[PDB]
A and B are shown apart, each in its own frame.
Chain A
Amino acid sequence: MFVARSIAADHKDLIHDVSFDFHGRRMATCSSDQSVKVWDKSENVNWHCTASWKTHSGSVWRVTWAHPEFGQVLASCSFDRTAAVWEEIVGGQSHWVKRTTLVDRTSVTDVKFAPKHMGLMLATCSADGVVRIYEAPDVMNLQWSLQHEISCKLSCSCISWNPSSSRAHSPMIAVGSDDSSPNIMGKVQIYEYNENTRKYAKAETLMSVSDPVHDIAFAPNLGRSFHILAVATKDVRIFTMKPLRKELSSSGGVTKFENHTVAQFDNHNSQVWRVSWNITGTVLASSGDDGTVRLWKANYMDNWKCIGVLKGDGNPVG
């Protein structure tokens, strides 16, 4: 019996995105009006606009929060070919201050902070088919150093860090490929950090994702011996990735992978545009051209099913 309560946003232009902070006490919204707004949740469960500023002169494609250990930090990326880092400089005098602009050749299609145990790192991807990884050398001085350039050889549309804090797994990034490519398949690529070469190397290519990829999400690993990846294309796909075996005598490779499609769902009825896991990785949300958000969950027999569908008027489908 989910209940939705409308608020009068009164946005100058429609906001193309909303992002919660890590604690779900704050949200950021962004719009065609060239602004970002920040909203704080009162004790009475009401939202109040606490900051509003003009951010750019280009289509803000993505917004992301840093981990709260680095303070109140936002990153945004744009059609203007830049990513920007913002810090909430409060006195009640909040005024999200631009700390840097990353300027290294085409639209920056996605931006994601790395898992906190890797430090204050930011990945960007661009339609030039490059992923760039920056590091802030001082968390108190939000200067950024370009650490890595990863040539994907396909237009990058989206990126996901593997959130696994296990020291048994090298840092991993999934990347997509929007290119319609009548033929080229492999539109999801996986990169692994190689300690011996101090470089990201291509570990995997999901050859079954011959369709254009719109979004990708690694599931929270929560002690599994295998990774789970959701992929948004013309359908919703779920992959399990099992790392292969090993010998302590010597090792310098990407440790090849066994990949299985465990689910494929065409029930979207339109090019599924977004996929998002809940905080436990037990429920998937998807959105598509059918004007619905769908909720997916496995039962105790690992059988995934839909568990909810919505309407244009805002009512949940009976």
Chain B
Amino acid sequence: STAAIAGSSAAEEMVALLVQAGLFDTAISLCQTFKLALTSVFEGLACKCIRLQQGGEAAQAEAWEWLAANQLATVITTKESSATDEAWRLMISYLDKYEAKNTLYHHCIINKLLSHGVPLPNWLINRYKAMDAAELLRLYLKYDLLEEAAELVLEYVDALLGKGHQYFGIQAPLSATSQLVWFPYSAIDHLRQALGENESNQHNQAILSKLQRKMDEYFQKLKKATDDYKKLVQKPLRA
């Protein structure tokens, strides 16, 4: 039918109808020629993975057709997994391979994900948290994830104190003088507001008090490190 409609098509109606019915290869090719930067393919594949993870039988039967229309470069190595794992593996692949200088990337994915429910499948998270060690805190406090937002911030502070800095793309703690240290003050102030708007909520107050005590420990150590840096920079104007 669309055979007839391809008889008068265009450089993006095509892209869309085809990203529609599986074919996640033919289209990465049509795009890379007519250079038109493709985040609709990744969002649509993420939508199919989500629908499969919450999909009915009939959806599993239909999924073998579009899975076979790709290889999956190489298949397998052990226990089987009812698709599920199938499309998430075509992921790791169509990602790491076809990847870009800017962001057809982590962002577009994390977004369609918090967008339709998901404890984020840990691969993506781990990989957008040493390459872009924050802005997600924002995707989190926007998609009403207060609990997990306070968590990320605490983790980052822990990194900054020399503890686990490798899991936060941080170079230094109390060493090689003082360089740069971005403090996500606006996200912390939103957390303080959100914890103060819950009031009765005892759990949120317990978390808020734990976070405040930890921030005070950080500011006391920051004050000491800044005072010691001021003493270090004052030695030497005696050359």
Contacts and interface: CB of A to CB of B under 8 A. Distances in A.
| Direct A–B contact present (CB less than 8 angstroms) | yes
Nearest to A145: B123
Given A105-B164, A198-B53, A139 B78 contact: yes
Contacts of B163: 105
A137 B77 CA distance: 6
A60 B79 CA distance: 30
B56 interface: no
Contact of A146 (B53, B126, B164): B126
Interface in A210-264: none
Contacts of B119: 197-199
Contacts of B33: none
A198 B119 CA distance: 8
Contacts of A199: 119
A120 B79 CA distance: 8
Contact of B79 (A105, A119, A140, A196): A119
Interface in A89-128: 105, 116-120
Nearest to A201: B119
A87 to B, nearest CB: 15
B122 interface: yes
B170 to A, nearest CB: 15
B236 interface: no
B164 A136 contact: no
A145 B163 CA distance: 23
Nearest to B88: A198
A166 B161 CA distance: 46
A180 interface: no
Contacts of B77: 119-120, 136-140
B7 interface: no
A134 B119 CA distance: 19
Contacts of A198: 53, 119, 121
A233 B121 CA distance: 36
A19 B53 CA distance: 40
Contacts of B54: 196
B161 to A, nearest CB: 13
A315 interface: no
Contacts of B123: 145
A118 B77 CA distance: 11
Most buried by A among B54, B78, B123, B164: B78
A119 B119 CA distance: 23
18 contacts: A105-B163, A116-B79, A117-B79, A118-B79, A119-B77, A119-B78, A119-B79, A120-B78, A136-B77, A137-B77, A138-B77, A145-B123, A146-B122, A149-B122, A196-B54, A197-B119, A198-B53, A198-B121
Given A119-B77, A199-B119, 18 more contacts: A105-B163, A117-B79, A119-B78, A119-B79, A120-B77, A120-B78, A136-B77, A137-B77, A138-B77, A139-B77, A139-B78, A146-B126, A147-B122, A149-B122, A196-B54, A198-B53, A198-B119, A198-B121
Interface of A: 105, 116-120, 136-140, 145-149, 196-199
